[PDB]
Structure formats: structure tokens, C-alpha cells
A = this chain, B = another copy of it.
Amino acid sequence: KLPGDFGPPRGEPIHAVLTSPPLVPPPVNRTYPAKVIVELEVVEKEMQISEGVSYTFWTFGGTVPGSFIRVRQGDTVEFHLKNHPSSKMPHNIDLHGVTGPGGGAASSFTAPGHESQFTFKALNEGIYVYHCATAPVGMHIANGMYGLILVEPPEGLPKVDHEYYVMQGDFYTAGKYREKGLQPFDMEKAIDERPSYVLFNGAEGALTGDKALHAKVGETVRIFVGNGGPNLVSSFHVIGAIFDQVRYEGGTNVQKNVQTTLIPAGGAAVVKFTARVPGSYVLVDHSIFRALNKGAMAILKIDGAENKLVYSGKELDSVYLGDRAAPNMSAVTKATQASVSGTLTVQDQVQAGRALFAGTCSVCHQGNGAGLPGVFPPLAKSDFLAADPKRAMNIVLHGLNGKIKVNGQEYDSVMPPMTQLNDDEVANILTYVLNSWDNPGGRVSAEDVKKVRAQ
């Protein structure tokens, strides 16, 4: 006998309601198998992968990850794939959990402006990745063509207060991390498995700040977690909390009470969290340069009463979360746009630099530029800064060590280099500093920084 042997579809055909990340459709809440009609449209379009950094994404339903599909084990699914007329490429779909060659791929080839359909029975309960399967497949996946399909057990999943949808992917731009402009896909970096960005839900900051996930003390949260890849394996982890349960795909095994899991490329898991104390809980790939240098962090923000018996301490800040502590970094987007338009003002630079200074500089120099006397020199009203702005560009790019005198006090420490900052970032940060804290004003341009970097 096949699994999912619940008899022929009954009732009326159901038109599936799909959701955009990070939301999930309601529980199916049904005791009979149905014919479920799923309609999903591929759209190719430019979106911001980071502030001021555009990328041509290929999407299922206009989002990365693609629209979430929710059905019941034993359902017959009539799957309709449309390819928007604006597309340049053909596309198709492989749904994990489908019983049949290619997971649908050979019956879903869809040229721009066309539609395809195929039917399958959902024999297999579980959470499953779906993705494009059009050669070169890795390119399609790298461009954002992946999402999740949930096939519920017949009795449904246990009730929880919130359900969310989070999916990791690795991305490959020609430019370096945070280099502005429209960035092409880079096949060389992709083949080498050397991503420039590693993200949740298709962009830096997609689930941070004002886009965080929410719940309250005492509530339960289920997260459907995918890893679209194409290539990386996630050391998936929640900072400051624990997973009550982790279940992969439709596996019989359920791990309980773990904080760090491994999610294969192409894999998916359901995790459960119980909110205990208020604050920001960070979902990361704990291959930690991905999380804190390439974009792979997402926030579940918990509202409610502190419990000093459990945790006496404070909410996170920029020391850990960096420039993603703040609600957003829209000033960076704005300054980048103004540069393109040729209208970049001092204040545009100042506000972009303010956003970028958080974490990146404030960890040592403080949010108010005061430093710490004799340990971290001040940027506020800094004689040393004012004396030589070009030296300050060199200090950001190349670091500084040795004895110096700042505002009458000696420092004898080490500031690490920061050459990974792009020329616009250095320029905007230094313009912010120059225009703060009784510093002399003026500006540093990206071209100024380019020249210092080349010397």
C-alpha cells in the first residue's frame, strides 16, 4: 500500500491560498482528502539585496523565498506554473516530497508568457523545499528560485501562537559585499561555493529591525526553516534561546532541546520555540562570518515582562547586532540613489554614515564618539581627526597602531584595518563623524577614498 492512502478526493476543489514570507497560510483544518489547485507565477525582477545594491532575482510569486504552499497528506494537487511575459528565461519546478521523476520538473517547463500544469498526490507528510530545475539549475536557484511546501499530517500540526517562514540562501554577486549598483550573478564564485551574501528571505535586513518577527512572553512559535542553498549547509542556531523541537522534512525522528542544528543544502526543518523572557533572539548560520559579515541574521523579538530570576541582563544592541540593531538603514539607500542622480548632499552622507557607524565604529569609539579615556580615543571634537582628514581615510582602510596623542591624552593600542568597507561607506562614515560632535564639518567623497586605497 502507498502512504497517504486516505481515499479519493472529496468535498469541493480547493484553490490554495499562498502566502508571502515570512507569513504562513492557516492550518488546513480538514478531515478529508481534497483536490487542491495551486497557481504560482514566476516573476523576474530587480530588487535590493542590500541597501543601494540591486540584483536581478528570479522568483516564485514575486518574493525570495517563493510563496508558501500548504496542503494535507493524501491530497491530490493540481499544480499550475505560469511564467510572466516579462521573463527572459524558461522556468520549471521540482517540489521535494513529490513522488515522480524530477519532482514535477519534466512536466512544468514553462517559457515566458506560457503556463504548464501537472498533478501529483501528496503521499509524504513533512516540510519540503521546492525550487527551479531549469538548466543551469544552480544559476536559477542562486537567483532566488526556491520556497517551501508543507504537507500536513492528517490530524494537523499541534496548535501554536505564531507560525513563520524563514529560508536561508547563498548569493553570488560579481561585486564584493555591499558594493553598490546592479550586481550581476557571478558563476565563478558560485562554482567555487564562495558567496558574497548569505541571507534569510532574500535581502540583508529582511527580518531585522522594523521587519523582525514578533511574539510575547509565554507564547509558542513554530518556524518553517528552509535552506535553498544552492551550496551552503547552515549551522542553524538561535542566540539566547533553545529549540523545543527540531524535525527535518517528514522524518519520524524529532530532536528536542537543542540550540544548534545542521540544515543540508536543499533541506528544511520545523522548529518550535517557547518565549520565556523579553528581548531579541537572533536566528543565524553559526558559521559565523556568514551571520555577522555576509547578512545571515534574522530576529524574533519578544515583548513582555522581564524575569530577573531567569535573566538579569539587557536587550541586545549594536555590539552584537551591529548596524542591524536600528529599525532600518534607509539612509544608505537614499544616499546611494542620490549619488547615482548626481545630487548627493552633505546631509545625505551624514545620515548614511550615522547608520553605518553603529557597531562598525561605535563598539570602540562609542555611539557618542567619546571613546574611553586612555583606552579608545575620542572621535568627538577630535583634534587628531581634524588635523588630517586624509590620514583618517588611511586609518579606516589600513588600521592604526603605535603611540598617538588625541585631545591631550596618549593612546598606545591597535585599530584593526577595515579595507572590506567600500569607498562610499568609508566616505559616508567619515562625513558623519566630521559633521558630528563639534568636528569641523566638510565631507569625504568616495573618489577621495578610492585614491587613498590605490596609494
A242 B124 Cβ-Cβ under 8 A: yes
Q: Which of B105, B256, B260 contacts A96 (CB 8 A)?
A: B260
Q: Which of A19-27, A47-55, A412-420 contacts B (4 or more CB under 8 A)?
A: A412-420
Q: Which of A158-166, A191-199, A431-439 contacts B (4 or more CB under 8 A)?
A: A191-199
Cβ of A90 to closest chain B Cβ, rounded Å: 7
One complex includes copies of this chain to the number of 3
Cβ of A187 to closest chain B Cβ, rounded Å: 7
Q: Which residues 230-269 in A have Cβ within 8 Å of B in the complex?
A: 230-233, 235, 237, 239-242, 248-253, 255-262, 264-267
Cβ of A294 to closest chain B Cβ, rounded Å: 8
Cβ of A371 to closest chain B Cβ, rounded Å: 10
Q: Which residues of B contact A255 (CB under 8 A)?
A: 248, 251-253
Please count how many residues in chain A sit with their CB below 8 Å of the partner chain's CB atoms.
117
Cβ of A301 to closest chain B Cβ, rounded Å: 10
A102-B239 contact in complex given A135-B322, A289-B191, A292-B137, C-beta closer than 8 Å: yes
Q: Which of B124, B139, B231 contacts A416 (CB 8 A)?
A: B139
A97 B277 Cβ-Cβ under 8 A: no
Q: Which of B2, B190, B242, B262 contacts A310 (CB 8 A)?
A: B2
Minimal Cβ-Cβ distance residue in B for A360: B135
A251 B241 Cβ-Cβ under 8 A: no
Q: Which of A107-115, A204-212, A344-352 contacts B (4 or more CB under 8 A)?
A: A107-115
Q: Which residues of B contact A413 (CB under 8 A)?
A: 88
Q: Which of B101, B106, B320 contacts A137 (CB 8 A)?
A: B320
Q: Which residues of B contact A364 (CB under 8 A)?
A: 89-90
Question: What are the nearest 8 A-B pairs in CB distance?
Answer: A107-B313, A100-B311, A101-B279, A266-B286, A235-B264, A119-B312, A252-B256, A106-B314
What are 14 pairs between A and B in contact, CB < 8 Å?
A: A2-B276, A105-B316, A119-B308, A120-B313, A121-B309, A126-B257, A135-B320, A136-B293, A138-B292, A231-B287, A242-B250, A248-B255, A250-B257, A253-B256
Given contacts A94-B320, A99-B241, 14 further A-B contacts (CB under 8 A): A2-B276, A90-B363, A100-B311, A101-B313, A106-B319, A138-B292, A190-B289, A229-B235, A231-B290, A233-B287, A235-B267, A237-B266, A242-B250, A260-B267
